[PDB]
Design a protein around this nucleic acid. Structure first.
Ligand code: MN
Ligand code: MN
Ligand code: ZN
Ligand code: ZN
Lengths: 602, 60, 607
DNA sequence: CACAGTGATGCAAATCAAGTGTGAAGCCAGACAAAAACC
DNA sequence: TGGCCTGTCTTA
DNA sequence: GGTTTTTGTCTGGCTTCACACTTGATTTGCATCACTGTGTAAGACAGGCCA
DNA sequence: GCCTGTCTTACACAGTGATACAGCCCTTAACAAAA
DNA sequence: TTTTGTTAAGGGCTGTATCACTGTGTAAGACAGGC
């Protein structure tokens, strides 16, 4: 029967075909497919041919010798193949192996729809203020209806975005598998639906020059699901937390725009609807179906991803050269330099909105200098609530810069030479450079960086520099200073110091105070009314930041490269649709679902 | 693929080992073949292996 | 639903049909329940239009294994511009998820590359080539060819990489092996036949403009294109191979890539002269090379047709294009060419040009510069490459249309009757013509000359249109005949083989161009200014001679290499080590592989 | 400065290939009753 | 006519 | 309550793989190399307002 | 009756993701041609 | 007696041929310095 061709087998089996179709229509409502599938699987199992039966079951589940269109999508996206390229590979492999290993282009588009915002239905209770309840919304114009007539302000920018809620929905549905499995891993039940709390790191950076060749700048507003806890009784048990918070991979894009991060008018115009949406979500519950069961989520948004320049810009504060050097407190550069450590986090978004109104209203009729001291730098109206933090890098860098200056000044013995000239200090610096090259193999550089700081902040480096210091009494002081630095460093370098270094976390304030004291006694020569934002944050606010955020390390220079990559290779060369394609592509590229396939070899 | 010199050797020597001990398991027969041939003379095996190798190479 | 329930449950719900099927199998098919259920399910799948799962089931039952040969993997990688890391991601993922190794690992692809690159097969030259090594394992070689680089010497500011020209000839022939054997078969000849094959190689060279990724960075490409292979089978030369798309970037095998300016004569000659030496050497020897087990012998014929005019002039010692000596085939001046429209012949040659450079250099009749220049016809520099300058079908059309357009404007202004006209009058004439073409012929106006304007304007319909703007009908008759002659000439320069497709057109071309020029000289006297373009001169003077020399025109066109620059930059960005010595040979190797016919066959497998 | 990302590289570890006798794993049949949802 | 406080541009 | 289903129960004798062990020459897996171009931000540097 | 770079856009086409259209093997019964 | 072809009207997936669209390379011209 099998050596026969198609018309032959149709004929010689026509009788059984009629009998089988009759039985199928009469017993299963005409579902011939299910009847033949089960018949053949059961026959295979009956003949002890479990291998072929399992492979058939897998071909019906799409797991063997045919890639699921989602896996094709993961490959294509994750390898930056264009549709033309992808189709060439698809058609070629199919022609040469006869089998359709990769799926066609229409299958990949259909698999895209599921992974893009706007596909699953959801509810907000109570309905979000000023946000549409439509759930089938995906990519929408980033201008949010900004007027474009020739009379109005000139619009020089193209941007595309998601509605912030819909994107949260898609990101949760993307991680559904991790959420269920984490519930299992905490010895909890799959079907529980009690209020899940999602913590969300909110992030914003400009991406420099994006141009393909005039500079073309881009802003990326993005988010990261940081942690999802479930409430069991009255314990909040974590069901998920991101392993690599800072990775490009889990940084879910929310809006991409072709604009300058310092173009304030445009920035507020484009970002303000997103903030409006996030405000809306701050007081509502999200109902979303996972695994057949309706689940309920509530969110905590923490804008910790903003470098200092963008913090200052969105919170109404002055530019970085200001005297008000801290975005956490009201210190001045002079105050922070004289007052070494006793500073506390003071500022808040509301305090800044009121300080703006005070600037604006001048209620006590003061002069501009008196008003500026009254509002401690807030001269513009804030429009984003940030959680300004510190980067562990900048702690190391600020410390190392101070130690470098102390080393060169201890070699020159600056206390004995108060009127030392520029060239004498320069030769001091040259002496230290030369000796550090000979002893520690450190190429003197003129721009401070992480690797130089990492190699210089060692006890052995202090011994090396002491080899050039006459007084050993000052060897004592320099070595104790470096010891204190090495005690404080783990706290801000770890990713969870309350387990990895709890002794140091405790002793941090004692150590910081002793460090500042030793600077104020033995090292008075390096006081001149100047200190950096980074050094002030390291000595004044680190324990407070760990109390608030838990970690320093956990809370984008590839952003530029990745943006440009997508634009050049995966996007229509038309102003209308390039940004659509780039945003869609980046979103797909951050899906944990496709990433799982790409890691399958583990 | 063409057999290793040791492999062709074992195909030829399976009858001697089998006739002398009939119920030796695969682990046991292979362990023996391997131990005695490892102790060994075996140059014609390597010659046959190289000849079969280059024949298979030609095979496109 | 049946699929909802367990195997015990589904067994229960289907027991009756199972018994009936066992009866049917024993009564009709010899008891093969397995085969009967398989065929039932396959045909049901085909009925629900789900052919994909049915074919996958068929292949898994046949057990036919799905494995791509490393060569096919390489063809896909090359032809889709995947870097090694990106290929490795796709490979590892497909292998992890299907558990089968459909794509091969990277080391297998490298190995497959070695076969397709110069330096792999062995060969011999009889007699050994003069001043060329007999080593056959040479691949990429430094393009400077041992050029001195010490600080005392001339400063070497360029990076270049190349193949040894015989070695590349070998690699390209081995690549075409399957096409050679199939062509012999298609000509009713024997696969094993070995009689002397002849290879007509087209040589080419061009600048690639800017290559910078962001200071300009220019590139030169030296290439060759196997145009046809014949075999002497009697006193007959049978055509067993002919390149189907000769201007494609796909068959333009890169010989030498160099980062240098095509106008930088010192570097140009330093880098190319070794190649020219190997090409010369090959002109006096026969290549023996084993194909399909049979040694074969190949004789080559190098024709340098791949040179645009600027590069022709530079390498053949002629003056720059603005010269009075406008033709690279003959000694005419622009004024002579304008006055004497049709009667010129192909008199220049590489030997004549070398000679005239010696004359220029030695000034043997002690002449003034103007007299000496006149004597040597503008060959003021020593040629260094023998070329075969030609014309492309495009410029024939372009020159004719530029003339007809100017004629149209002047005929609207009755200049045959009024000698003088202000700028405003001529501008209004041109506006009239442009409006009238936009209205009746749907011709957009254009501010610069171009091909398809010419194509669409050179129709008898446009002549009726413009005749609607001319009052005198004797001039209608004149225009209609001038266009008739145009249309009688066009086939010859457009067609692919004019000897076969339009033998009467080719036979009457010369007569027709004489009558064309006579019509212009009698009833169109006004359009004589002592000016004319090389395109128009070559079209009216040299077309039959070029066809007799080459067989055709449109196939030796300048059209294709504008993609080259793009190609180059792609390979430099995505498939190249970021180090100046290595990026170049990586682009070279990728460009070779991109041209291989073996791989292209895999990429056209569906047909 | 760091670092991204290229094609090449180099060494450790699978892997292959043959012999075959096991053990493990799943399935068959037929009368029938639990634990379950349908009027 | 400056220091020099502020914002722009440069180089590692 | 009757009337419909799912899902077990008890055996063995079956069929179909995986493992077993060796040797050494291939093949894969994986981290690494050397290397520059490019983005970014640390840090020189130009500058004009008012005293 | 100048030469010869530099500059400027016209112009075509490349090559993107989306989209529209055509061609594909069938699906009913029956004869029946090759084997 | 066992395999395939075949008709006609007509219904879905799949393959490729465009869409529209703009950046971009090459080159057709214009132009101006040779103090
Ligand atoms: Mn930034
Ligand atoms: Mn050129
Ligand atoms: Zn502070
Ligand atoms: Zn001529």
């Amino acid at each position: 029967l099998l050596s026969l061709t198609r018309r032959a087998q149709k004929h010689r089996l026509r009788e059984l075909k009629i009998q089988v179709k009759e039985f199928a229509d009469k017993e299963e409502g005409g579902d011939v497919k299910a009847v033949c599938l089960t018949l053949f699987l059961l026959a295979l199992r009956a003949r002890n041919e479990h291998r072929q039966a399992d492979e058939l079951e897998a071909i019906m589940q799409g797991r063997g010798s045919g890639l699921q269109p989602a896996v094709c999508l993961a490959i294509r996206v994750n390898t930056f193949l264009s549709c033309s390229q992808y189709h060439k590979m698809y058609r070629t492999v199919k022609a040469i192996t006869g089998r359709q290993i990769f799926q066609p282009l229409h299958a990949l588009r259909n698999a895209e729809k599921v992974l893009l915002p706007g596909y699953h239905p959801f509810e907000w209770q109570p309905p979000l203020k000023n946000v549409s309840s439509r759930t089938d919304v995906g990519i929408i114009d980033g201008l949010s209806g900004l007027a474009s007539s020739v009379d109005e302000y000139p619009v020089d920018t193209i941007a595309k975005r998601f509605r912030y809620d819909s994107a949260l929905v898609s990101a949760l549905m993307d991680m559904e598998e991790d959420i269920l499995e984490g519930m299992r891993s905490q010895d909890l039940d799959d079907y529980l639906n009690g209020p899940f709390t999602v913590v969300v790191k909110e992030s914003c950076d400009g991406m420099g020059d994006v141009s393909e060749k005039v500079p073309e700048k881009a802003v990326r507003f993005s988010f990261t699901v940081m942690r999802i806890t479930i409430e069991h009784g009255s314990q909040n048990v974590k069901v998920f937390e991101e392993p690599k918070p800072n990775s490009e991979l889990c940084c879910k894009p929310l809006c991409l725009m072709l604009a300058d991060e310092s173009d304030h008018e445009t920035l507020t115009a484009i970002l303000s609807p997103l903030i409006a949406e996030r405000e809306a979500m701050k007081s509502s519950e999200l109902t979303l179906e996972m695994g057949g069961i309706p689940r309920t989520f509530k969110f905590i948004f923490r804008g910790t991803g903003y470098d200092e320049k963008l913090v200052r810009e969105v919170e109404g504060l002055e530019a970085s050269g200001s005297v008000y050097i801290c975005t956490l407190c009201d210190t001045t550069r002079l105050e922070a330099s004289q007052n070494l450590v006793f500073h506390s986090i003071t500022r808040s978004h509301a305090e800044n909105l009121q300080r703006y109104e005070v600037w604006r209203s001048n209620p006590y009729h003061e002069s501009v200098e008196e008003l500026r001291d009254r509002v401690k730098g807030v001269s513009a109206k804030p429009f984003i609530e940030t959680v300004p933090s510190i980067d562990a890098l900048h702690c190391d860098i600020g410390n190392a810069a101070e130690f470098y200056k102390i080393f060169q000044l201890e070699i020159g013995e600056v206390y004995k030479h108060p009127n030392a000239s520029k060239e004498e200090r320069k030769r001091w610096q040259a002496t230290l450079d030369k000796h550090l090259r000979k002893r520690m193999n450190l190429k003197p550089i003129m721009r401070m960086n992480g690797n130089f700081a990492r190699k210089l902040m060692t006890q052995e480096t202090v011994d090396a520099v002491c080899e050039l210091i006459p007084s050993e009494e000052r060897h004592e002081a320099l070595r104790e200073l470096m010891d204190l630095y090495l005690k404080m460093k783990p706290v801000w370098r770890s990713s969870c110091p309350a387990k990895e270094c709890p002794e140091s976390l405790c002793q941090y304030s004692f150590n910081s105070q002793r460090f500042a004291e030793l600077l104020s006694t033995k090292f008075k020569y390096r006081y001149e009314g100047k200190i950096t934002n980074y050094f002030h944050k390291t000595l004044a606010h680190v324990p407070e930041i760990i109390e608030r955020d838990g970690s320093i390390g956990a809370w984008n220079q590839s952003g530029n490269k990745l943006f440009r990559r997508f634009r050049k290779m995966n996007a229509r060369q038309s102003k209308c649709y390039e940004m659509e394609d780039v945003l869609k592509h980046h979103w797909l590229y951050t899906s944990k679902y496709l990433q799982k396939f790409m890691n399958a070899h583990n | 693929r063409p057999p290793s010199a040791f492999f062709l050797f074992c195909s030829e020597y399976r009858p001697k080992i089998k006739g002398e001990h009939p119920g030796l398991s695969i682990g046991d027969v292979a362990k023996k073949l391997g131990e005695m041939w490892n102790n060994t003379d075996k140059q014609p095996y390597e010659k046959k292996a190289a000849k079969l190798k280059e024949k298979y190479e030609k095979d496109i």
